[PDB]
C-alpha cells in the first residue's frame, strides 16, 4: 500500500467521522492507571484469568492490529516504554454493533483509550479485555514496517516523534540526559551553590573563544550578540559577594555541524570563592564518578566511538582520575624537549612548533599561531590517550586568557580540562583576579582580533572594573552537558542527545 494514498483515504475517513458527529478528536479521556502500574499490578495473573471485579481505563498508541476471528481482535497498546495487549472479544464488548464499528474504525498508529478488565491469554500474555474502546487521536499516515528500526538519520532527526514511536532506546537517552542535568543541580545545590540566570544577549560576547551569532535590537538600534559563555557575569556575581554560583544553560556558536558540534548546546558553569583548581579537580572527580555510578549502576561503562559496527572501549570512571601536565607529556610523546615555558610568546617558539607540526604531519590551518599549533599537537599526541577520565593540566597562558598564572611554573596557568573518550567534557581554572593582568591579556586578545581572527575575544571594560572592585580568590568550571550525555548513552553523535538537532535543509 502507498503512504500518500493511505494518507488521502485516512484523512477522508476521519473527516467522515467528523461530519457524523462521531468525534475522532475527543477532549477528555479519564485514564485510571499507567500501563506501567497496570503491568506491575496484574502480572501475577495465571493463564486464562479474567478479573470480573476490576475495571480500569488505560490509554496508548496502537502498534499492531491482528485478528484471530471475526469476533476476536488483538491490539498492541504501547506507552511509557512499555506494552499491553488489548484482547477485544465481541462477548465482552458493550454491543456487537459497536464492537464491529470500533474495529472498523481503528488502524495501527491510533491513540486509543481502553476501559476493560485485567486478564491473561491461555498463552500467558497479560491483557486488558475491553468493555469500550475510544478513538482519542487517529494516525493519518502509514507507520513504516521496519526490520532494523528507523535507521534513516534524516527522518529520525527531523521527525523526532517518529524516532520516539518506532525506536525504544531514544526515550532512554533523553531520560539519562535529564538524570545527568538533575544530578548536577542536586550536587551543587547541596554544596551551597546558588542557581542563577545571566544574559543570553550581550553587547560584547566573552567567556570563551568562538564566532558569535549577531542579532539586531530594533527599539535600541544596536547589535546584540548571542552568548558563548556566562563566565564574566558569574565572576561579577562573586565580586558582589555571592560566593558559590552555577547556571545550566544554553550557549551559541556560529560554527559548523559535526558529531560533536551543534550551533546551540547546553553547558553548566559554576564559580566557587576561596577555591583553586586542585579543589575543583577533587569536586569534579566526586561529581563525575558519582554521576556515572548513580545513573548506570557502575563506574565502568562501554563506549562504541565508531558505532556498534566498531570497537568497544571500556571506560573506568573509578577515582582518582589520571593526571597529566600538558607540556611535559607533550614533550614525552614527541620525544623532544620543547622551549622553556616563559618563552612561549616568542617567534622562535612559534617557528619550532610550526616545524614540529610539519614534520609530525599535524595540520594547523591558518592562522598558525603558537597557541593553535600547541592545541593541534595536544589533540594529536595527548588527547587520544585519554580513554578513561584524564585531567590535562597546567596549560600555557597563551591558551588561557582568563586563567590565573601558575604559582610555580612561569608561563603556565592553574588550569585543567577533563577528557573522556578522547573528547573534552570539562574546562576549569583558578580564576584571574588581577585587573591589570586581565586587561593586558584582553589587549593581546584584541590585537589578535585586529589581524582578522573572529574567535579571539573582545575587551570587556565593565568586567575589568568589576575586577578592580575586588574579585576574591576564586576557581571556575564548565562542563559540556551534551557530551557527557553522549558518553553515558553510548552515542557517537551529538544529534543523538539533542531532541531537535540542527539540520542543513533538504
Amino acid at each position: 500500500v502507498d503512504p500518500n494514498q493511505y494518507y488521502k483515504i485516512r484523512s477522508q475517513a476521519i473527516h467522515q467521522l467528523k461530519v457524523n458527529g462521531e468525534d475522532p478528536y475527543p477532549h477528555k479521556f479519564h485514564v485510571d492507571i499507567s500501563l506501567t502500574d497496570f503491568i506491575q499490578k496484574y502480572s501475577h495473573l495465571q493463564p486464562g484469568d479474567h478479573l470480573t471485579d476490576i475495571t480500569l481505563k488505560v490509554a496508548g498508541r496502537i502498534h499492531a492490529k491482528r485478528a484471530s476471528g471475526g469476533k476476536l481482535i488483538f491490539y498492541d497498546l504501547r506507552g511509557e516504554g512499555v506494552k499491553l495487549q488489548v484482547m477485544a472479544n465481541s462477548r465482552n464488548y458493550k454491543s456487537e454493533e459497536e464492537f464491529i464499528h470500533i474495529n472498523n474504525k481503528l488502524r495501527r498508529g491510533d491513540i486509543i483509550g481502553v476501559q476493560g478488565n485485567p486478564g491473561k491469554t491461555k498463552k500467558g500474555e497479560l491483557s486488558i479485555i475491553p468493555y469500550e474502546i475510544t478513538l482519542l487521536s487517529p494516525c493519518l499516515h502509514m507507520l513504516p514496517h521496519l526490520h532494523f528500526g528507523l535507521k534513516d538519520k534524516e527522518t529520525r532527526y527531523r521527525q523526532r516523534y517518529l524516532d520516539l514511536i518506532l525506536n525504544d532506546f531514544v526515550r532512554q537517552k533523553f531520560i539519562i540526559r535529564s538524570k545527568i542535568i538533575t544530578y548536577i543541580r542536586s550536587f551543587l545545590d547541596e554544596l551551597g551553590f546558588l542557581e542563577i540566570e545571566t544574559p543570553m544577549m550581550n553587547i560584547i560576547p566573552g567567556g570563551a573563544v568562538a564566532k558569535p551569532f549577531i542579532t539586531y535590537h530594533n527599539e535600541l538600534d544596536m547589535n546584540l550578540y548571542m552568548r558563548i559563555a556566562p563566565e564574566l557575569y558569574h565572576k561579577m556575581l562573586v565580586v558582589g559577594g555571592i560566593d558559590r554560583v552555577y547556571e545550566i544553560g544554553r550557549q551559541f556558536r556560529n560554527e559548523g555541524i559535526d558529531l560533536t558540534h551543534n550551533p546551540e548546546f547546553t553547558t553548566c558553569e559554576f564559580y566557587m570563592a576561596y577555591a583553586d583548581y586542585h579543589d575543583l579537580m577533587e569536586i569534579t572527580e566526586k561529581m563525575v564518578s558519582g554521576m556515572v555510578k548513580h545513573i548506570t549502576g557502575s563506574y565502568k561503562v562501554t563506549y562504541h566511538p565508531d558505532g556498534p559496527e566498531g570497537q568497544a572501549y571500556d571506560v573506568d570512571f573509578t577515582p582518582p582520575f589520571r593526571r597529566i601536565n600538558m607540556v611535559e607529556e607533550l614533550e614525552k610523546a614527541l620525544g623532544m624537549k620543547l622551549p622553556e615555558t616563559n618563552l612561549f610568546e616568542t617567534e622562535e617558539t612559534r617557528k619550532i612548533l610550526d616545524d614540529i607540526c610539519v614534520a609530525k604531519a599535524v595540520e594547523c590551518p591558518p592562522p598558525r599561531t603558537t597557541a593553535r599549533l600547541l592545541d593541534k599537537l595536544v589533540g594529536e599526541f595527548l588527547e587520544v590517550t585519554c580513554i578513561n577520565p584524564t585531567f590535562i593540566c597546567d596549560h600555557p597562558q597563551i591558551m588561557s586568557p582568563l586563567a590565573k598564572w601558575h604559582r610555580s611554573k612561569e608561563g603556565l596557568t592553574e588550569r585543567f580540562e577533563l577528557f573522556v573518550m578522547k573528547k573534552e567534557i570539562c574546562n576549569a581554572y583558578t580564576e584571574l583576579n588581577d585587573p591589570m593582568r586581565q586587561r593586558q591579556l584582553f589587549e593581546e586578545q584584541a590585537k589578535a582580533k585586529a589581524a582578522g581572527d573572529d574567535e579571539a575575544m573582545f575587551i570587556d571594560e565593565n568586567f575589568c572594573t568589576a575586577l578592580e572592585y575586588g574579585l576574591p580568590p576564586t576557581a571556575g568550571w564548565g562542563m559540556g552537558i551534551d557530551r557527557v550525555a553522549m558518553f553515558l548513552t553510548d552515542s557517537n553523535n551529538i544529534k543523538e542527545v539533542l531532541l531537535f538537532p540542527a539540520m542543513k535543509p533538504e
Binding site: 485514564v31 492507571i33 499507567s34 511509557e80 544530578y183 554544596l191 551551597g192
Partner: protein, 31 residues
C-alpha cells in the same frame, strides 16, 4: 576540603506541600 555552606533551600525536595491527585500516577523519573 572546602568549607561547608548550607544549601539555600534544603535539603530537597518540596511538593511535600502539594501534590495534586486529579490525574493518574506516573513515577518520578529520578528515583
Amino acid at each position: 576540603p572546602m568549607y561547608q555552606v548550607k544549601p539555600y533551600h534544603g535539603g530537597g525536595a518540596p511538593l511535600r506541600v502539594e501534590l495534586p491527585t486529579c490525574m493518574y500516577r506516573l513515577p518520578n523519573v529520578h528515583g
